[PDB]
Amino acid sequence: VSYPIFTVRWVAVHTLAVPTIFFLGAIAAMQFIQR
């Protein structure tokens, strides 16, 4: 078939996918903070 790209599903998927990775990256950095 001739499927589209940007769809509603796409939007949704990204609202959760994009922040997640941004957080997983943030957290991953925290593993090195100390005192």
Binding site: T7, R9, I21, F22, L24, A26, I27, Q34
Partner: protein, 82 residues
């Protein structure tokens, strides 16, 4: 059993996808990392740094004690080098 959306399977397999996401995914990652590692996050959320819970001597807690003048009261807590 179907709707307009392009079957994930195809996309997660399309070399185009990875050519895009090999850039996009690590990008977001390195961004968030920097968000923490540059100390920016600490200021965006007023979260104390390991050396900012108490003043050197003080062992008391900066408990906010009144609603309306809270913000003002909070600011003063940062004053005592807390």
């Amino acid at each position: 059993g179907t709707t307009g959306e392009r079957p994930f399977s195809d996309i997660i397999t399309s070399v185009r996808y990875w050519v895009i996401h090999s850039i996009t995914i690590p990008a977001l990652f390195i961004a968030g990392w920097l968000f923490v590692s540059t100390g920016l996050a600490y200021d965006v959320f007023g979260t104390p740094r390991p050396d900012s819970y108490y003043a050197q001597e003080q062992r008391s807690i900066p408990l906010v004690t009144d609603r309306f003048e809270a913000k003002q009261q909070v600011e003063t807590f940062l004053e005592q080098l807390k």
